[PDB]
Structure 1
Amino acid sequence: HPKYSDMIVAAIQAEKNRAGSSRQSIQKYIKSHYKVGENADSQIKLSIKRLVTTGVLKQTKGVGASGSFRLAKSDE
């Protein structure tokens, strides 16, 4: 298997559609070829929690925990 910032790239990159990108449609695609452990959902929200704050991923619209994201940082 590959890492979870390896997995988060594959869903949003391949197709590009529902709610810009959001939490359910990412986890549906991700499970098909990561091969699911129980920790999948726990370390997929953690991967998002540190990727949104670093600059690799930037968020479109939300409040606190919920929302929707993109890949290209804002103004870049």
Structure 2
Amino acid sequence: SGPPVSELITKAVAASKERSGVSLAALKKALAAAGYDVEKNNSRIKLGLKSLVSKGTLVQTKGTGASGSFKLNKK
């Protein structure tokens, strides 16, 4: 069970906060380094990485959907 993976993905994206945002590749490598499965739950991450762009907590920098770069909200 454990906590839902939204908190895990927020820790993964808040770990670095590069000026050019994290790729989907680098964030799933961070989640795999954390230990969360990224191979069978990649549909769950696939929907989560656009749900988080949609709800406004995180904004997408340069890519589209779950592609490209990502950064935190202004406030």
Name the Cα RMSD after superposition: 2.3
- Please give the TM-score of this superposition, normalised by the length of structure 2: 0.74
Alignment partner of 1:58: what SS?
Answer: strand
Structure 1 range deviating more: 61-70 or 7-16: 61-70
Shift of 1:64: 5.6
Q: Percent identity?
A: 43
Stretches of structure 2 that go unaligned for 5 or more consecutive residues are none
1:10 corresponds to: 11
- Please give the TM-score of this superposition, normalised by the length of structure 1: 0.73
Q: Structure 2 counterpart of 1:43, which letter?
A: R
Once the two structures are superposed, what CA deviation does each residue of 1:21-63 show, in whole Å capped at 9, x if it has no partner? 1100000110123432643321112111111011111111124
1:28 corresponds to: 29
Q: Displaced runs of 4+ in structure 1, greater than 3 A?
A: none
How many residues are aligned here? 74
- Give distance in 2, aligned partners of 1:12 and 1:28: 11
